[model samples]
Target chain A: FRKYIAITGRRNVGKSSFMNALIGQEVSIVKSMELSPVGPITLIDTPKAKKSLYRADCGILIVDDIPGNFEEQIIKLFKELEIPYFIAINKIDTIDHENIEKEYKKYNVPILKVSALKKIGFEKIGKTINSILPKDDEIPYLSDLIDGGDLVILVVPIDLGAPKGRLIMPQVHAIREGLDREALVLVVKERELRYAIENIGIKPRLVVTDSQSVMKVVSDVPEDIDLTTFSILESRYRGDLEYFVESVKAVENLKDGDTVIIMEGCTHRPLTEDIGRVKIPRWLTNHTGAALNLKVWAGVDMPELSEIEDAKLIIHCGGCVMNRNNMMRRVRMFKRLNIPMTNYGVVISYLHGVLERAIKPLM
Target chain B: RKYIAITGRRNVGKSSFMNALIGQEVSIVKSMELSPVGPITLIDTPKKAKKSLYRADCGILIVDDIPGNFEEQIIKLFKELEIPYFIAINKIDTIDHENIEKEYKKYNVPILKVSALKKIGFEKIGKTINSILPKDDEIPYLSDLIDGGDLVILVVPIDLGAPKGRLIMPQVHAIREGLDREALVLVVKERELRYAIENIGIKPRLVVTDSQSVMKVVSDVPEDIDLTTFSILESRYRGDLEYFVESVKAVENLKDGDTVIIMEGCTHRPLTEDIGRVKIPRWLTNHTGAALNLKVWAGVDMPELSEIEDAKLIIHCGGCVMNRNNMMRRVRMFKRLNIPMTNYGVVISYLHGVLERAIKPLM
Candidate 1:
């Protein structure tokens, strides 16, 4: 039982009261015979928050005596997502426990009775919550590469496309996931990557870099240290990675005057150093050393059959902003036409001749 | 265990019969569902009759090497009776064998060639007959009652209703069946039933009486002697006996004012003491002490619902001359109306107070 437990309830259901009692002395250990007690876990609560459940190992759905739309909506969501949750019927002291239980008995989940306002029956709730925590060895992110206490260094380039005042979504996501896995996490810009690697106390298990800085990061990070790009992981995470890896061979077979399609997920302002329009095209032209036709399609617009009929290869973006359905549609269309396709990160790594080292962690 | 009879004009290539017996060709259409060897009896007959074959368990129709009206007539007769039979082309040696064989091959049954005068192919005919005859267990008569070596007595009343110059169909049928079963068969008029029983060298296994003479024969034979009538065996053989037996109980429950309908399968000339009209009604009235309102209908003309709406019981014929379809129609009609229906023999036995003993052999 090693999973983090998430407790949620609608307004005025005494969720905070139950949490306070469960943690006992400000987020302290709650021991049980069958479960190893976990301590010092931060309790982050929110209204209409579903991200906590996915991020956590297990969840508890708290409800009150008055039956309302909240119970119906929560049960439906839990059923659809197939998440394991326990029901904490709060405020039983204000209503008949038997009547309240009978109304919800049809849900077929474990139900606990407690008056969170009085801190009654909080011990049973804690014990049951411990019993259902996921027992299998699983990690939140970088699960295939990182384990507890392993070192992971993230190189997020603070370039023009970076959002102001904070790291981008993928960088922030990797750091929090590393913390969840109880790993040693270090985040740095591409310029300081060499110094960070030299001064680190222990050999890092993995080094994840931005796609644009992959060439420089490859030289900075030692060959022994596992290195990959954030964009590559995002590509594998959101689309078919095997298809992208196999299509890299098509880059080697590029012919003179052949059409190459470049696709991006969002309609962002094209800067001077835009990775899709400028950087990828420059690298491909330099690598192939051939006169080629490059067609760029941005945002939600897709390329027509005639436009891509004679194309030699397709270069897709990391799909950071597109849903899986949209990305898969392009994969299927290219596959139907027998055209080879690769993503931006894989193409960049291939052009630099380090594609083998970049995808080694996933292998 | 079984028997087959071959019938044709005596002179129709008795010589080719020998060729059929000696021919090397195996029968192409043997009964694949039965075992190879069956103990069989063969009866040879001359001209215009199916009597010998009906009494035996199965049959074969042997013919000359040339086609004629005799071949067509027997084939049609065999189809009507639903008996399994084969064709034998006799005296193929005396004709152009190729044309003769081709012409007889068009008949649906398997055709064999023989020269009986030369004794050429009789062996195959012998083997084929033995295979086609039904095994002992397949016969549908009162198999539970009769066995080989048992003596069975028949009581036929030579009254005005008896057919001139011959035994009636049921009586002649019983004698031939008793012979084929290898049981001792003895026939006598009703007037000599007592003398026949007393003077016989051995006790009979059972005694069969005509329906009109059931009253005298039931008393003439001792209570220990198993006794039944031709009509009763015919009912059990050609129709459902269980329904008739169950309906016999309704006879005792009939009221004085209730209607009773009597039905027969043949439109035979009705004498003054016709069994369905004068005899059964008299016995039913005498036994139940009720003046039953009786109506008689003969032949295939079925009674409409309105005609028999108030009838409490229907006493039907033995159905010896009726096809299974016609008999089943009346059975279904009576069952749909929820009225009781019995046959001539079952009703006769029930009225005589010996119904239990009369049905004991069949049970």
Candidate 2:
């Protein structure tokens, strides 16, 4: 259901290493379903044509220098299949882009100058890729939708109850990613969003607000503008959104007195109005219109399978306080044990009846 | 659902890593791809102790200073047991990096660095094992084979197959999987297959038929359309099909008085004229025109090494009758026993001289 990207090249062209670079981690077999710049993508590092190619929606050819006849065959193969691809000129920290750019001009597709070793010139990969490939709304990275020079307006309601005189994590991520994606970023409040969009001079391509402020921002933001919330974006950014969306259905499927397990990867007694215990509980009960028994596990102790085996749905933390490894362990544990689980951010959006709208701008 | 055994000398703190990875304080929690099996004491403690490694698909050979004795022997067992594994140099803070990979480099498997006490490079261990021994594809069904909305024509010749009152399990699985993938699955008998191909509103992406009916169905299937048998797909879907394909060449080496073993995972009252008992042996005998010493084992019973020692070739039933792990166990044992084993569908194709053509669609 999601898009796949195949990274293919000749031997020692750093296809596997470059895949690791793309993922920012050393992968074993060079196949990963990871959170990339273009969203949660399944990347396969292959020597040449592979079966995964047929499943791949896109491709990137990693080469040492210019597209030689062998690389050209791969390029033409990608073109023949109409699988959108680009030539990645790897080890470019040593090469002159000006000279190499000339040799790649004949390919007629985007040629990215990258160094899987030096980790240079990779910033533009996800931006350039999503900027060109098919808009499969099935999946996203913040950089996935907006291109370089696109207008992105981030709505942060920071006047009254803002965090310790600093930006929140996801908001900071937005501002940084906005600049990194080379978007024209406009940071504004919920009230200021109206002034920036309608009363203000230019129409922004996107208006991303906080989950708490989505209702307010949703009304103020124009229907034409692609609107989403940071919580929604953060869902896919840190964790699997498709996995979240899939598990969100379990909420709807709850019957009377069915237990909903709330899991917080954070080992904390969250502050007042904590969603994991109170807000999510109330919302789910209201949504399902059932006397849902909520069992909260936001502490350090990992819940035993037997404990949560009968749980109808497990609402999990955004993995904000957990590492990917531990989070995945929990994910696999629940999945293997045949239990339904979803992130708080995703469940939040769905509970607010803004899930579809929030994800509308993501893919 | 796969197993991983940790092996080295007694001092390497294999248990520490097992604890660190599986859980802190040794909760013995199982990860998705690799479940840490029962500890094997490698000190005295080893006379080809395969009780742990035999069931494991992969192993983590933990090493610190690389003791010349047990380290090399366990590495030997890994290969002898046919388990794909990596070397994790645990407590790297203590050992000289040069002293370890320097000695173990001759083995040339993936070598990772870690400290179980500090939990340093276990992430790499996870990534390595995950890469080497990846999880089964989520589409453990037909979705991976066909596209959403693609037409799938299933040829099921129901000739008194016993499920008491139901369709063959594989065909039922095929039908349900097609529907789940949003594919247009049409079930037709061997006789009706010709009419379905001729008169059906849409062309099939692929036609899948039972091994018994594949010969009849193949002729009716157009040359342009890709076609394969149900049991061939099962051989691929459940276990290693390519290995089976390679072993089908065993038929070419069949000599007079050579022992040929017929294996079946399910003993569910095999039909009077069975593929294992009647068809395959007859077919292979006809192809080789040799006096083959054929033995049939139709149950969930695993054969002892002595029983299969003289076996020149082992032809097996489609293991769709059992869990994938059971099929893989047979595959692993056969592979390690230095014997060639193939299944009914693949052997049938080889018998008909369409082995390459039948599997070409998969390629």
Candidate 3:
């Protein structure tokens, strides 16, 4: 079971170019506006470390961008995921020589210097990544969690933002993981999840869904069935799951008309009802029956957070466009300001009334 | 020739601009003499003070981030010296439409926009410079021994910071210019310059030198030989060459209770006599009859002069690390406060009793 190597770095640090050069494919887009591709390393046009950590048989190995205080970020990921990782020192060729030594030495972590622009030393990097791939035996089989041959139902939403005709990274990964575990997977949109489970006549050992639809999925699924979400699992896998779970607990403390800032690292075209700003606000209002103003910030120009400077709670995107260092910096900033920062996964679990059920597996 | 000075406040793209203009390697010399010399390979490190002179002679002195807050000694250098100069409006690419023109328009020089990485707006700048170059007769041919076919001697004192084998940028550029004019050139150390001139057995047309070794070079050369330091020519080439020449006149105006600042762009280790910290201050004490108080600040740690009610003048670098935008900003700061600003060449020429003659040709 070989793990996939993902490349991540600061914008214009040649993350995409290096990946393209490495694979000998015209894969990564040159433009920064092109949201970096996440998973599917075998995809001809995909960037190395865009969205999802690639799921190889060895386990999902992540390569991350070097944001400020990168050492702390790598440590955080290691503590949360239990996934073995490799650091690819991307963009070493771009800066002058002094920084090449100074920056990598700052972390004191193992790093391989390869210039994506020059396409140098990546072959060795690829070999190094392969060497650290997890063995197949290390991956936990789904049968270990649920009884063998149990069926699992996943509730997805038919949102306009959903990429047409294809499952997103988390959705695809969940189905594949279930298949590898020999569990029956019934993936349906929110409208069909309840009916499909009803018609199946066999109670699902577990139910997983898109985090945004978590509350509805939980309400529709039987109380006896175990429920979880992609965002919830993702946060746990990428960063501190327990910390996020605790943040969900803290979210209940929000007052009416309070402001919550939701930050997304990448953005696509705005749907009729933009999800992060409009849909999330509408859903939260429906759940809590209060007018909580939700704000959204994207990319580098994150809000200064003048409003709710003291009481604001935040729901951040999983570290996608952001490297762990950047994500952790925001987390630390929120912590310093005494504001609780949670992820979409934690929020979905909390709203679905299955926060404990989702957190149990992580502990 | 058009003499242009690159000037800006510190770290806001001065060194970067210079590198972009000429595509050469120069580092900011460390200010604290005790700081061990760092990896010399970094292309844009700010410590090479004399390199700006090379840039000035190459017909474009791309000074960036010249700090506005120099002590009085640096201020005296800027007020004199008359030369024709150009301005680079660098880092425009970094701006996201803040009050750019409003902030920069006050500089009053023809501003050329550029981003080194983007390679925008450089050709037009080169053309602008060529258009403004002084007529052929205005170009001075240095030689007392009839320079149409005479040999010129150049004395370069190799300092501890100077790289071995390769001549520093300014010296290399000056010698190249002289060679282009078909002058036979002699390169020798300050100690060897006299010997070289004697052995040549042909009355040399002129002797050129590094500014620090100007006094020795001038003393060694015959009184009839046309002698000047690199910085003197650089000052005349930069438009403020006359203004700087006049500013040094105010050195006599030093009061019983006055402040002086001797600022250097890049810092370096002091060998015996620290030029900026020790030597410059010692000279100021001797030059001014009063017990003159002087301070030295090096590198990007330039003080803000706007509110420093006590600072009577600002003596800055030759706008070496500074882009014109920042230099002009500092100039405006002094202008608004009615305080004078100048560079090293003007002050040295005045002190060397050659200020009037240096400016006379430029004026």
Scored against the true structure, residue B7 in model 3 reaches a CA lDDT of 47
TM-score of chain B of each: 0.52, 0.67, 0.49
- Show where candidate 1 strays beyond 4 Å: A1-141, A149-165, A267-273, A299-303, B1-363
TM-score of 3: 0.29
Better of 1 and 3 by TM-score: 1
Off by over 4 Å in 2: A1-363, B1-56, B60-82, B86-139, B150-156, B159-166, B266-273, B297-304
Q: Report the CAPRI category for model 1.
A: incorrect
Q: Give lDDT tens digits, candidate 1, residues B146-223.
A: 645444444344333332223355654564454444454444556656655664545667877776687767778887
DockQ agreement of candidate 2 with the native complex: 0.00
Distance (Å) between predicted and true CA of A179, model 1?
1.5
Q: Which candidate is the best by TM-score?
A: 2
Docking quality tier of candidate 3?
Answer: incorrect
Tens digits of per-residue lDDT for model 3, A1-363 = 112343434444555666565666323454111112322233122231212332211221123343465445544544343435445665555543444455545544445666666667655644454555443232231334554343443435443323322334555455445444444444445665655556444466777666667666767877677776666666755556666777766666666878878877666534652555666667677877767767776664333446436456777777555544445545644654557778875775676577876666446
lDDT of 3 by residue, B1-363 (tens): 122445444655666665555543223641111112212121222332323322121123232232245312222333332224455656656752232354434534455667776767655655565554433232332322224433434434433323322335455445434433444444445655555455444465555667767666666776666666667665543324544555666677887677766655455534653554565556666888778767655654324433334655556666445444334434444444445666766776666776544344235
| Candidate 2 clashing pairs, residues 3+ apart or interchain | none
Instruction: Quote each prediction's TM-score.
Output: 0.30, 0.39, 0.29
How many backbone clashes can be found in candidate 1? 24
Chain B of candidate 3 achieves a TM-score of 0.49
Candidate 2 on B1-363: residue-level lDDT in tens?
345666777778766777777542223444433224233222112254754344565777777774577777777777777777888888877774865545777887888888888778765565576666734442355555654553444444433343322345565566545544445444445655665566444567777767667777778887888777776777787878889999988888888889999887877854664777887778878888998999987667456556777788888877755767678777887777668989887877777766765687675
DockQ of every candidate: 0.00, 0.00, 0.00
